[PDB]
Structures are given as structure tokens and as C-alpha cells.
Prior knowledge:
part of a larger assembly; 4 chains; C: mainly beta; D: two-stranded antiparallel ribbon; about 20% strand; RNA-binding; structural constituent of ribosome (chain D); ribosomal protein (chain D)
Amino acid sequence: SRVAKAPVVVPAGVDVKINGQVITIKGKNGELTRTLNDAVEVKHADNTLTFGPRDGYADGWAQAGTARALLNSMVIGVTEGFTKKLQLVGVGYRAAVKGNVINLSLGFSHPVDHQLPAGITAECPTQTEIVLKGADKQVIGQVAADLRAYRRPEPYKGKGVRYADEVVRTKEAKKK
Amino acid sequence: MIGLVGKKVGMTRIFTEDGVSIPVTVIEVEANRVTQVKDLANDGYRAIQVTTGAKKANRVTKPEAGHFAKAGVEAGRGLWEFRLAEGEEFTVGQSISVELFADVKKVDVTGTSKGKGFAGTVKRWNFRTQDATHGNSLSHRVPGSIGQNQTPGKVFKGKKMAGQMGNERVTVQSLDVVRVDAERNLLLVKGAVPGATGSDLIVKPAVKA
Amino acid sequence: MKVRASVKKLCRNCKIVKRDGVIRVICSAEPKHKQRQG
Amino acid sequence: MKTFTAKPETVKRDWYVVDATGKTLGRLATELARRLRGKHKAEYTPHVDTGDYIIVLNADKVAVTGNKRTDKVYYHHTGHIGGIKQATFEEMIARRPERVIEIAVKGMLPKGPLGRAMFRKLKVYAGNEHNHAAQQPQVLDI
RNA sequence: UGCUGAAAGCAUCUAAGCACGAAACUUGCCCCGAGAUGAGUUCUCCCUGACCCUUUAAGGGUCCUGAAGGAACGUUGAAGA
RNA sequence: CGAUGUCGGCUCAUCACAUCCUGGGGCUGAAGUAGGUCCCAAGGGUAUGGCUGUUCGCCAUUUAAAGUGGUACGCGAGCUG
RNA sequence: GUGAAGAGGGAAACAACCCAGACCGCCAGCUAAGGUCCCAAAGUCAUGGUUAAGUGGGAAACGAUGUGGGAAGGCCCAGAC
């Protein structure tokens, strides 16, 4: 509605291909392709991207909004890219990158080795930071959710793999 | 991989050097020789049919003799079939020896067990005997009750009752192969395998991890 | 969480969401306010 | 005079091939059941199999509406006691989709020796080709 | 439990899309199993004669042949009422 | 009512889940260990004895646990009495 | 009122419910209740809505930004949410 009505301003050097419902967007950061719902009609009109509800379908407005935001993310994903930043709070928590495998030492009796998918590149400026970068937004959201999911932030102390921006609310023990 | 067809020679023991007796079963595995190879393009599945031993010339029938004659092989005492494992390749008339188990470390042995005939439910299903005294009237080894009452008013399927125990295919899994002797054509596995002495076995590599 | 047949907003941060045909109360302030099945 | 009765020695019956891609299961099934009874022929007779041979193909591509792709459950009991065995629609399409069309049509056909003989005339395939090119099935667009 | 994400310019695990997730479920393991009348497949083996009759049919009969194989019989079995 | 044998024990089960154990999980007045409570889950498992005709119960000593019910308060053309 | 002492059609099956009261015959028509996609006779009829829960095709207090309609009302492009 109010989201679908605002157009996606496509910057220079970004390639947009509308093959029916399939949308391919390729810029400086990588080819990234979706297939929208059938209730979304997308029109380029030479300057921007415009999203409207395909006629005959009930919830198409709602669908259109999603398509909007998704392609907005895709435009950032071919221009600037997305970056999640995770930090590891705990005594003896280690993070390293061999190739695209994130080795993690999280107080386990076995090493943790997370295989990143194809499009995502992680770095470690410190032993207790993982700054991972990529193009698709749900994919780095996914991967940061997995790395958090190995050791989630424990509530009493804060020990775990937290996001750099997220606040972790603590509490004391029962008595004394 | 594939297996080989043996013959239960009997049991012995193998004293180790540090003095631990190992109960072994001796399985003579002669030259299993391939009589047919089966491909997807003709049968829908990849498998070899082997034979072993030797049969009398007058006792093998003309169908059977024509089969072994096509294969270019001596008639054996039977035909068995092993499913192939996607990268294996055999030719017809190729002989397979116990040497195949020179790496395998643990096998599964399949035979027909010893036929115990019509067995009652105490032997067969380990039912527990009722009182041997204290009043009991002609019902010592009998099965007890066999079902409920008006609801269901039927005995359910696969109620454990008495009947033929024994004389059926059983596979013993994960037996430690103690020796492979290519000279005498022998395979010594640790433990008991199914069957009386002289019974035909089928020794495959263990599918369990 | 609390499976009840009356789910309500206990706090001002509590929030009614229907997921998979199930009414739920998702709070951010207090996780004791998490509820299901209204 | 007497009402005409079809004679099963002299019933002529044709071969039809039906593509089941994207058809609704019950609506296709009901049309097939009508054609296999022989209800579409004026020589219909309730104790004579007068229907046609139908070759249904692309049985794995049949469609259902709503959440019936995952909620429609096919129960059967095995005879052994706790033998109630269920399988949803997508599990059946994965394992054997022929069973989906054949269960439907079979439940729409009269139970009895005749309706078993009527179901023997339905030939379902999960693919696009059939062995029955010798019988020359003409394309029944339904 | 999430990720992206609107309807609801925020928020939101769900409406479109996507990822995890248990001894339950389908397989994997063992056994039975083509009467699976939907009675399947593969390999091999055997049989390559004449002549009548009629209400001419996948009809009946006579002579000559009797295969592959099975069954019977016997000696029997760690198979078996 | 021209008969449907009725407690308890034994033998033999079988289903339900409103789960005792094992398995997954949320909240905790959850530091850990051990818990409490609630959701999911029926695969498999789920005592021996003293007393008593007893089911039950109390006690002794175990156990991962000694589940709750239906099945003519399952089971006497199966046993006991 | 029906059954008893009343058949027939319907309600799956169902004395007592709905329709209807069987003298006999007919391979004739029209109807009642009830129905018309297939089992199973007859609309996969026409027009306009509603629900997506297989609701329809059990079950309440109570809970809930499910969704269609109606009448008002507060604030609002001196810019509201």
C-alpha cells in the first residue's frame, strides 16, 4: 500500500531484466534474481521500478509491497551490499576464517565449522568479531542467525554469539 | 560389495598369542564363478548370478545345463545372486575367491537355521510355563488365554501361537572375520552362524557401520 | 510460554500476532508474557 | 416388446487417452468413472460393462484445491492389529501417483464384480508416454 | 526457534518466499512376498507327423509318436505330525 | 431368569494418551547440579519381596521409570478356587 | 399424531420422525417429502453475494488487527496516524 506506492529508484549501471515474472538485477556487486508473485505487476518505465497489484487477485496490494521491499533490498545488494557484524562474548570464544569456513571455538568438546554458502564472505578483524558481507539480504540474515544459533546469548552473563547491534538483557541469580 | 557362497564346515577355536580362545566358524568358500551378469538395460537391476561347488553330470537337468553351458562354466550345486554396488564390474565365467574378504574386517552370514519342527509356544516364543503343581489341571505348557472377550471376539493377526520353528532364512550380522585363507579356501568368522554343518551360507560384507 | 484459551496483552509492549491460524502474544519487554492459543 | 439389453459379446468399445495435467482430481475422476461405466452411451445397461478404455497419463501432475495437497490423508489398515497406516497426498504423489487417480476412480465405480471389471479398463501412467500405441487411443479432451 | 517481508509508510517467523527442528512418520536393518487374478521379469531346455467326419468351430475323432520334465517306487536326511 | 459364571492369582495380551522413563522444547522466583510448570511425542521400556483371599495399601530393598485408563471392572469350552 | 394393527418413498442403515395410507395387473404418465458430480434416477443449471476453516460434515463460557456489510463519531493537507 504505502510501501508499494513509492517507486524503486534504480541507480546508474544497474541492469534490470523483466522476463515476465522473473526479475534479474545485476550491478557492481553481483547478479541477483527473484521471481515475484503472480499478483504483482512490475513496470520499469525507463527511470525507476514501479510496483502495482495485478488485477483480478485479492491480496495483490500486500504482495506488491513485499515485491517493492525485496527489490529495494536487491538494489542495495548490487550497489553497496549488506553487512552483518557478530561478536562473541565469553572466555575463550574464537572465530577464524579458512576459505569460506568459519571455524568457531565456543566452549564445546568438538570444533564448530560453519560452511558459508556461495555468495557470502566473512572476515575476522579480531578473534571475537565476525564481519560478514554479501549481496542477498535474507542470506546474510540467515547465516548470522545460524552462527548465533550455535551458542545463543546466555541471559545471566551474556556469553554467546550476539549481534553487534542487539542488546542482551541480563538478570541476577535467585538469591545471593 | 558382493558376497560369496560358502558352506558351514563346523566350529573350532583359535588360540591367540596372548591366550584368548576365539570361537570361530569355518566356512569353506570355493571358487564362486559368475554365470550371469544382469544390467538395467535388460533386467532393471545390476546383479551377478554365481554358482559354486560341483554337481553330478547326470543329476543336472537340461535347462540348468544349458544355462551353465551358455555361461561357459562348470555346473555347480546351485545358483545365487548378488546385487551390485554401482561401480563394480564382473564378466561371465569370472571366478571369485575368498581373497575378496582380505580387507573386510567384519561380515554378515546368512543361512537357513536348524529346523526344530512343530514347536510349542514355550520353545518357540518363550512363553512362561504355568504352575507345575498347586492345583493345575492339564495346563502346564499351554499358551494361556489368546485374546479378550466380546470386544473383539477374534484373535488378532500374528498372535504368538505354536507352529513350525526353525528351518528358515536368518542372517547374523557384524561377525568378525578372524582369518582369510586363500590356500585352503577358508574363511574363519568369530561366532556361530546359522545352520547345521554342511549347510550353504552366504557371506557378505557388513552393511552396518 | 503460556497456552491459555484467553490470550491478552498483559503489557503495553505485548503484541497479538496470528501465526499458522494460532493467535499469539509476542512481547519484547518480558518473555513471561509470551502466550499461545486464544 | 422388451427393452434393449446390450450384449457383452457384441459391445464395441473404444480407447481414449486423457492428459491429467492440472486437472482437479475429483472432477477428472468423475468424468472417467462416467466413461468407464458406459453412462455416456445410449446402449448403457447396468449389468454389462459397456464403457471405454481410458489411458490416463501424467498422473503425477494432477491438482487439488485448498490445502488438500498436504492435508488430504489416505488411510488404510493392513489387517494386523495396530495397522492403521496413513499417507498424505504429496507422499502418495512421491511414492505412487497412479494410486491417487486409481483410488479416486475406484471409489466412484460400483462395488462388485462388474465394477472391478470396469476398473480393469482404466490404465494410469505417471508419465507422458504409454505402451498402447497399437490400440490407437484418440485424445479425449476432458 | 528463526531469515527476508508486507497487508498496517513502524513492528511482524507468514499472507508470497526461505532455513532449522524429536525415540513418533516414510526410508535405512532383518524376514515373508506374483493368488501383486494388476497373476511381472530374466536365462535356459523340449516338442517341426499323417488322415477322416460335421449341426465349419480357438470343433470332434483315428493311427503314429511320448520330448524337456515330473510323478511314483526305493535308500534316506542336522527336513519332517 | 427354556442360565450372558461375577472377586483375586496365573498364563497370554491388546488399544488410548489425560506421558512414569527415554526423546524435542517454551517460561522460571532457571548461576551450575537438581528442580518446578507448561507445550510436543505412544517408538520401545515400564520391579522383586514381607503381611493379607485381597485389588488396594503399608513396609523392606531396588530401578532410567516402577504411568493412568479401556478391552464383559480383557482373559474359568485357557488354569486355580 | 404415528407404531401397536400400516406396507410404499425419504432420513446411510433406523417400530414410533418427514411424505404417504398397498383390491389385482401394466417394460405408461404427473407429483409429495427428499433430491440432481460419480457409487445412484435427475441441473457438474442461471443470476448476485458469503467462507477458506474441508467450515460445511459435533461441543460452551471466554479469547482474537480473520473477513463481508450498515449507521454514526474523534483528529485531518493552519498537515492528522
